[PDB]
Design a protein around this ligand. Sequence first.
Ligand SMILES: Cc1cccc(-n2nc(C(C)(C)C)cc2NC(=O)Nc2ccc(Nc3ccnc4ccc(N)cc34)cc2)c1
Ligand SMILES: CCCCCCCCO[C@@H]1O[C@H](CO)[C@@H](O)[C@H](O)[C@H]1O
Length: 335
Amino acid sequence: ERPTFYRQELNKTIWEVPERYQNLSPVGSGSVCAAFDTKTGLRVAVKKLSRPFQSIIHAKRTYRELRLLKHMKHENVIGLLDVFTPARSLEEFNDVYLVTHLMGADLNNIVKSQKLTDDHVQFLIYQILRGLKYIHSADIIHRDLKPSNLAVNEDSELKILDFGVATRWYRAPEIMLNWMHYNQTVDIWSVGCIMAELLTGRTLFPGTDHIDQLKLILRLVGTPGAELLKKISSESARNYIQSLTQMPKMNFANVFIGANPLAVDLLEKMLVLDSDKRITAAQALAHAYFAQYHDPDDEPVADPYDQSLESRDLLIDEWKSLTYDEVISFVPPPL
Ligand SMILES: Cc1cccc(-n2nc(C(C)(C)C)cc2NC(=O)Nc2ccc(Nc3ccnc4ccc(N)cc34)cc2)c1
Ligand SMILES: CCCCCCCCO[C@@H]1O[C@H](CO)[C@@H](O)[C@H](O)[C@H]1O
């Protein structure tokens, strides 16, 4: 039975939440308050979705995020503690609030404050890969992995999230090249870029645009081979590649001066241009670099996820009814 809600106005924005959530305090831009979950004891983030049914793009996005977060159940992936609306019927349904564990800092804050030890990088990259094995096993590709999409607490425990520094800096070259298809290993490229930055304290590929971005990448990994050229479906992309002055692959050891050679070797297996040859998250977890963490009995996979549902062509009112149903059917986690 519906809980008692209380209204209050914060940061230019209304908030109507169950009395279960106390001491709401804004933490920025939808928009988010920190709160105390009186029921469970936990500090929470309550995210109020921004104009969730504004358009078919917003309505679909709202549905997709709710559906996904409800399905994510893993230590290294953001999970849903609660989802609510102050509306007591579909007819008055306009607002969606998502609740998750409050997060202190993102990886940016840790590397922008420091440069990390190899021990610390092992543990953080291990966890990103473990969460990705899970996400990937559900046939979900993150596509926007970057330090700010990684929450890290005081215990160095890490969770992958998607909050929505350029995204381009962490993006696999095939995305720069507007490839229509791409596999799960686009996310491995990003982990490669993140791990590099954590080990050196510098953005590996700080491109100013997409062409510059490819320039900086090819400078390290070398221009495509004849085996890779054969795999390019775009006549226009294919021409551009063949028009380049060949650059050789660099020796990563000669670039990541001082880093652990196993870290370097792992980077060599992640930052491969041919994505068919890039290491997968599950193979990565078994690399010698993660020897002290890797446990094949404790790196679980996800239940299968149906992406067709969020991809349909429906009316705003229909996405809205579908989102309402997802709110109503929420089953909370065990505390
Ligand atoms: C926008 C969108 C649409 C569809 C899916 C996602 N998405 N996808 C994922 C995975 C499963 C692929 C990794 C996760 C999400 N969504 C997501 O992470 N949502 C989310 C909710 C709240 C937050 N905000 C905060 C969460 C926790 N603490 C915070 C502290 C301060 C602050 N300013 C914000 C937060 C960040 C992300 C995101
Ligand atoms: C200069 C940049 C070269 C781009 C090479 C990226 C990897 C190309 O390799 C291809 O990746 C595609 C996307 O997943 C897939 O369709 C193919 O399975 C794969 O052969």
